[PDB]
A paper describes a structure:
Variant H2A.Z, a subtype of canonical histone H2A, is broadly distributed in eukaryotes and is essential for the survival of Drosophila, Tetrahymena and mouse (1–3). Best known for its role in facilitating transcription initiation, variant H2A.Z is found to predominantly accumulate upstream and downstream of the nucleosome-free region (NFR) of active genes or transcriptionally poised genes. Here we report cryo-electron microscopy (cryo-EM) structures of nucleosomes and chromatin fibers containing H2A.Z and those containing canonical H2A. While H2A.Z increases the mobility of DNA terminus in nucleosomes, it simultaneously enables nucleosome arrays to form a more regular and condensed chromatin fiber.
Mono-nucleosomes and nucleosome arrays containing either canonical Xenopus histone H2A or mouse histone variant H2A.Z.1 were reconstituted using recombinant proteins following an established protocol. 3D classification of the H2A.Z nucleosome dataset shows all classes with shorter and variable DNA ends, contrary to the canonical nucleosome dataset showing well-ordered DNA ends in the most dominant class. The final H2A.Z nucleosome density map was calculated from two best classes without imposing symmetry. It shows a well-defined DNA-end on one side and missing DNA density on the other side, indicating the mobility of the DNA terminus. In contrary, the end-DNA on disc face 2 (DF2) of the H2A.Z nucleosome is well-ordered. Noticeably, part of the docking domain (residues 111 – 127 of the C-terminal loop) and the last five amino acids (residue 40-HRYRP-44) at the end of the H3 N-terminal tail is missing at DF1 but not at DF2. Histone H3 αN helix that connects the docking domain with the exit DNA are present in both faces.
Residue numbers in the entry:
A (entry chain B): 23 to 102
B (entry chain F): 217 to 302
C (entry chain H): 1428 to 1522
D (entry chain D): 1228 to 1322
E (entry chain E): 639 to 735
F (entry chain A): 441 to 535
G (entry chain G): 1016 to 1110
H (entry chain C): 816 to 918
Write the structure that this text describes.
Amino acid sequence: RDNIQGITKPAIRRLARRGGVKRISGLIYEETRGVLKVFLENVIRDAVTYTEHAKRKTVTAMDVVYALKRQGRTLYGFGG
Amino acid sequence: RHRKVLRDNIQGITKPAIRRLARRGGVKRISGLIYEETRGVLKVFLENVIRDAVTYTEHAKRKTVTAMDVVYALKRQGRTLYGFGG
Amino acid sequence: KTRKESYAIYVYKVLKQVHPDTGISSKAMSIMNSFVNDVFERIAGEASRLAHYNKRSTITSREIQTAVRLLLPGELAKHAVSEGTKAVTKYTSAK
Amino acid sequence: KTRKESYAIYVYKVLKQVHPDTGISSKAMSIMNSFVNDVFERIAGEASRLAHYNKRSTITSREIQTAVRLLLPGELAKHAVSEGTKAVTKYTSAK
Amino acid sequence: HRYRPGTVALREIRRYQKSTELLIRKLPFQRLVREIAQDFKTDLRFQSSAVMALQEASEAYLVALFEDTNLCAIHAKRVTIMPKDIQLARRIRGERA
Amino acid sequence: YRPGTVALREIRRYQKSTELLIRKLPFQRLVREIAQDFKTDLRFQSSAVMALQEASEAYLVALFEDTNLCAIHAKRVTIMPKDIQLARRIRGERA
Amino acid sequence: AVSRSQRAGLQFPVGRIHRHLKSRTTSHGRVGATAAVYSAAILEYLTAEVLELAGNASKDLKVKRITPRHLQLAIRGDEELDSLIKATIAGGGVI
Amino acid sequence: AVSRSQRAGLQFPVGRIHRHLKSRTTSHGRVGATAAVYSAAILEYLTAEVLELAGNASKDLKVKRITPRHLQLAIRGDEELDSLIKATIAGGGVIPHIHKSLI
DNA sequence: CGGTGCCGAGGCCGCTCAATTGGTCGTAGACAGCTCTAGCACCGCTTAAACGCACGTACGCGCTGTCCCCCGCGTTTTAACCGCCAAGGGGATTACTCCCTAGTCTCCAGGCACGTGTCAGATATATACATCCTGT
DNA sequence: ACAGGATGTATATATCTGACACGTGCCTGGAGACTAGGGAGTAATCCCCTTGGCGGTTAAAACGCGGGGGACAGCGCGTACGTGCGTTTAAGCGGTGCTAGAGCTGTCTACGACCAATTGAGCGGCCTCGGCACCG
């Protein structure tokens, strides 16, 4: 169990259930593991760069909102 | 003194023209019902871009649409285009 | 500790204007606050860009009106520019 | 008639630096000019946004460096920040 | 003598891919641009460079759409594109109708 | 019982609610592991990792909905990795 | 002591919007007092539209408080605001 | 008696970049002296990469003059430059790309 | 459809700092006037491209086994969740001070339209070779 | 399974002309010199929110078994798009001319920036109570 493997099969299954997927194959688990890893990597690079600019060592919520705001995937509900 | 209320120019994008476009696009074979729908999508794309460019050039109080304003309109739609004005 | 600027009171006021009895959760209030800040940021940025395009330096009502005719889609923009002209006329035709 | 600002001469100079014999068409020169203006506009906008985030008012080298670490992807950004630090050190360690 | 059906298509693929020049007749496209420009505001004139740039952006967007629909159809175990492929690709990208 | 009913039950149930689906602690461990590379020994506000979880969940939901459209295009009812890769290619993230 | 917001007959703090617009400008950017009331009216109309849609959805669900789920429902329900707001509502949900 | 570009050993106008950055900086904002130098270096390196790629592309076609087709080929050839320039090249065309089931 | 509990949210103070009105100025735009570059409208001529159509042949769509494989349940087993306690790193202030950058004056030189004289690349043409299409 | 054999493509040369790199005269925005003030760098101090850990506790993961279902080769056929042919049109070019709106330029004025004395509304606490979150 690597640290990526926390995103397990029933979690991704329920996620696809929210999207309306009726039936899932086998390799989708590995596929979405890789995809979500890529996406979180892309966000967290920007968040760490913001925080390192601000001379802080704590990734606050405001910088996560900023990083999502820059990447065309803005998110409300946290101020900014 | 304007004349020539235009009509039927949507047929200007003729069938061999769209054929040539898709040939550039990397399409091998085309079913005959494509032409109407690609005419439609071309219509709506030009509608949005021309609308934004017209709003620009009307803001500058001009009776004509310069190229720089079309480039600006395409910039505001995420499809910015180099070569002409910026 | 220093107070932070918000918009919550004005959202509450306009809500009570349109709906006299209903309420709004605090989390939804924060959502609306962020949404107001986002829309106003977009309008201000677009107006600044337009003023820099037309080589002017004073953002009057005209560039703002063009910004809402730009961002918002059709009939929403029409209602918006109508309310804007109505408000600015009520402002100007006063003491 | 009033002259217009461009970048063409500097693009020609850096081209002759990297490639001593080749040439560039005028249309391609206009393309590169627009591309330079676009990248610089993106960097300036991002630096202004970052300075407004951190409640500061003086865009120094730090916010610019963060802007290029933001916009450009990884190893291109690494080469960019390396050349930036090298240039600013050559500037500072002078008369 | 006659070619096999499709070989001429691939010849035209190579031809119209390695070329660069524009692909829609200039005057009909300009007439269409003015026709769409009518209802938004009357008595409009156009710089020729402006209509040129509109043609460039138009052909670019249509080429991207056609390439993406070809990707969709070749995923769909066919060779001929179809209007539902175009509608699917636009629905994925973010546009709608 | 029969297969094909509990699925639709899950569709209804998991679209009625709005609560978090990915369980919090393994996701937070994943976030800390990923941030371990781009800098050393970070710290995270709980609100920040909550926001990251919310955004990632929304993104995965959107991707699944789109790849479901892609799969139903090919007359199947079961998605496949080529469908997800096709959807991400069409959006253009190419990652 | 006439409270210019009421002189526009509006709820939004037109002085605060004025000093907000005062900063996000070009080098020597100036804003016109006629523009602040216009932006205020724009924000007031947009908030009124979104909140009345959310309140209609709430009275559909028979709840005095408006939850973020109501905001998600109202935004994705009417096509116009969804076409305007491409954002992701925190804790909202799907359709 | 020296210019800031040669003072830093660059090729982009430090004064012009400084004036532009002063012209787009949140009216009560100020612009540091070194920041213009940094921005000029950044733009110089980006132009260096794109122009070197264009030259390497044109050299394989035996043309001493760089054309927009060469710009588009050089940009779409590389991956990360393609990730940067998301725009459209006027008259640049597309890259020769043929898929699997097209035969 | 009522019961009980919960604290989230709505209404009520103290206060302090941001609107606000009054007075000045000066600079930015409004506007009238004048030019003239460039966009619109014919006219004619050529001709390449659109267009109609006649076959036919690749192939899109549908149907049929069919075997992998994915969903549903059942049991265990495991690691998340809640609650609570502890230490302290770092976030968030205030308070100096001085480094740095906004200005102004003077100056001139790198930079920008303008011309022009050379030539690199488009175009054409005539060779020297790939390349599909039946086929013994 | 290469043998003809039209049918398209390297390739070298010839031309040719518009494009462009380089040389000019000119000329405002960059540089250098100085001064002022104020933004932030650093220094210190407080406190809080973050990490760490423990212990129960219990819903969710997780193998595993089984049974139906659907993904998919494989045929098979029956519309339809490619590949031509001849035929017609309007795209393009080149001119030719007409005029009007883009672009400067010079005045004039007006409105917004700036400064200050004032005061009230917007926010931090804070109380409190009833709208909702569950439960026969």
